[PDB]
Amino acid sequence: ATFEIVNRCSYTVWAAASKGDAALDAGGRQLNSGESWTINVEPGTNGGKIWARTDCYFDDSGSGICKTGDCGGLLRCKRFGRPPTTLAEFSLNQYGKDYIDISNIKGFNVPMDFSPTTRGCRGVRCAADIVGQCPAKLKAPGGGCNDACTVFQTSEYCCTTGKCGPTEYSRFFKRLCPDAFSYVLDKPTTVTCPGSSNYRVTFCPTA
């Protein structure tokens, strides 16, 4: 499958693509404002994620650190990123279908649209100004808005019992972005697309 990753932000993002134990395609790439990166994601991929990283410092070897979404200090991500990270999440070719969503469960850093290229399903978007509205206690020191589980590390927020409901902090994200997951047991906002669809992930969407 094809995923076009497009940076329409006024700032650079270091795009990342991983399925948690491995890179998808090259795993990461610097996208200056206006740049795009088209990757191939293998059919059958489950638990794939694409996200933006902001304010990265990499040396010539591709090692360093990002202020949001850092993946083990690498330019080319193999693992998932440090919160806060707006997440484009997908599993492909699952019983004939693809499944896509956006999640704020690990916080929000960059506004995102995640849409199919085909007409056979809809896209989803979380592009409200969550960082500008972020409650003080959730503000992340390098930018972005942490989820409450990251900040407080209690079962109320982390759902580590498999038993949790909405909170004032999940509702902060959910009201701003109803189409994104705001906590683990949120009413699902996963979209069913035709199997073997192609997609576009847009940072700072306007269309």
Side-chain angles (χ1 to χ4, degrees), residues 18-20 24 42-49 80 90-92 94:
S18 174
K19 65 184 192 70
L24 302 175
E42 289 304 310
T45 294
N46 55 263
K49 305 188 194 301
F80 293 142
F90 46 94
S91 295
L92 314 180
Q94 306 292 312

Side-chain angles (χ1 to χ4, degrees), residues 32-112:
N32 291 339
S33 178
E35 291 187 334
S36 299
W37 180 32
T38 296
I39 63 169
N40 168 79
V41 175
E42 289 304 310
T45 294
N46 55 263
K49 305 188 194 301
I50 289 160
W51 67 103
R53 300 169 288 171
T54 59
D55 292 314
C56 301
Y57 302 81
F58 290 121
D59 61 26
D60 190 75
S61 72
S63 293
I65 181 69
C66 302
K67 289 191 182 179
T68 66
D70 187 78
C71 61
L74 303 182
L75 168 66
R76 296 179 57 178
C77 295
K78 290 189 284 278
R79 314 282 180 267
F80 293 142
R82 192 191 296 172
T85 53
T86 322
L87 296 169
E89 307 184 309
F90 46 94
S91 295
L92 314 180
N93 308 100
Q94 306 292 312
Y95 302 94
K97 301 297 182 182
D98 295 352
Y99 295 102
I100 67 173
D101 70 76
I102 292 173
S103 175
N104 289 139
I105 291 168
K106 302 294 181 62
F108 177 101
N109 62 340
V110 175
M112 168 188 283

